[PDB]
Write a protein that binds this ligand. Sequence first.
Ligand code: E8I
Length: 274
Amino acid sequence: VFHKIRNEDLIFNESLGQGTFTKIFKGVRREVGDYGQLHETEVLLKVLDKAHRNYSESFFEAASMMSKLSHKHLVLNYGVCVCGDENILVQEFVKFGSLDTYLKKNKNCINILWKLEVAKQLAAAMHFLEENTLIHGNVCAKNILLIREEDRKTGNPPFIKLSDPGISITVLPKDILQERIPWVPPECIENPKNLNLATDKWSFGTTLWEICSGGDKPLSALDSQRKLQFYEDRHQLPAPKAAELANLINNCMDYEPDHRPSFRAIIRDLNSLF
Ligand SMILES: Nc1nc(Oc2ccc(NC(=O)N[C@@H](CCc3ccccc3)C(=O)O)cc2)c2cc[nH]c2n1
């Protein structure tokens, strides 16, 4: 149950792009904060396309269930604006944006320790979700937000958060699902209702591949028909050039969902690289 924010208290600024049936804007929220102090707070605004209003339930159910669990590695949702014909998610604005964009622009200055630290943090967030038996369902580098850059001057590591999952793959059209191979697992291509905790272990593997690959998209050279055939022939992703996490990636991207390792075991493996 989300706090309702008045349209009057939001200003829309620049477009930040679009997601699946959504438009993204940087914005500002006027609000009374602690001690009654007035604030104008930078916010991330996620607007459901007016033409796809039928998706609003899934749009908001995702963000809602995760926002019931507070955690340092999970994005903060302030509330929702449902004034007028709008369906707007009002979210904390993370200073350095999405991880995939960040990896591409910083490819030639991100070392293995940075990748391992970000992987550990992501695994911590997924461990927390697994303990709470809560499925994310759309783990990917675009849904990882970089709160803070690494600072070698103080040894401060980077700090990331996992964003909301957006519209569930259980209600999206099959062609969007096919294009999201290989983040969407084989069993969910076979049947979207196979969405399960084991889904998030597979997509975590794909996300590690992104992190280790300077933001390349795995299988981007394959069209949708060939992505399906990739799964039909039981292929695995190539090892990234920085190959240190390749075995972990493949262990997570196991075609047998019951064989995919728990996030506790994943965390132990990450720690053993040191
Ligand atoms: N909290 C927040 N936020 C931001 O900006 C985002 C907007 C949207 C998203 N999240 C998505 O864009 N999610 C996609 C996923 C699509 C997908 C998933 C798996 C495989 C293929 C494709 C979607 O829903 O379409 C992430 C960051 C920014 C940008 C600067 N600062 C920010 N702070």
